[PDB]
Amino acid sequence: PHVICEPCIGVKDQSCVEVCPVECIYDGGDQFYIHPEECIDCGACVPACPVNAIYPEEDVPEQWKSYIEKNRKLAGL
Template sequence: MTYVIAQPCVDLKDLACVEECPVDCIYEGERMLYIHPDECVDCGACEPVCPVEAIFYEDDVPGEWKDYYTANVEFFDDLGSPGGAAKLGPIAKDHALIAALPPQETGEH
């Protein structure tokens, strides 16, 4: 089991979860953050610090965002398990589900 980042993170990418993660398993794509399913230790430290409540335990992802589990997993198909996000830095791609979304309203103007 793992944690999943869902739609509220798209085009926001607040990095509070990255700073809180003790195992450095939250990677930055172009439009959102992704949790590596094999590197996550299910500690839950990321969930309460997310300002937009975009992080869910795998079994608790709301129905309308169930596809984000697959997006989080498949984002790493070509990356494998790098062993930490910090050494990679931002990754110049997103999962197709996210890339296809129109720009999201972030509340910032």
Template sequence: MTYIITEPCMSEKDASCVDVCPVDCIYEGEDQYYIHPEECIDCGACVPECPVEAIYPDDEVPEQYEAFTAKNYTYFDVPPPD
């Protein structure tokens, strides 16, 4: 499992999540931050730090943000889980 950063990040783009990540797996993209699915250790430290509640476990992403799961995996050229 990994965490997915969703649409609310696009308007805020706050780096609080980056600062608390113990493995530095959160990267800044042009439009938002992304969590590398192969580097994430599933600790969840980023979730409470997000001021706009944009971060979810990949199996709990709300329906309206489901496209962000594929967007995250595509950003890192990693196949999504089955």
């Protein structure tokens, strides 16, 4: 799955929402999040975010690893 990290907070641009083929990006309050069980890993959302907040799970920066679980918790997992 792909993960929305720190940069989204305080921005919530939402350009990512319009390019996701499965509509699995949801409002999580302080940031949007990607539902892990729905995401098909097509990667379309990556170039769409103006603040580079989205990363494939395997490539999430070491400093932002906590966002993997955050997206999971927001998804209710």
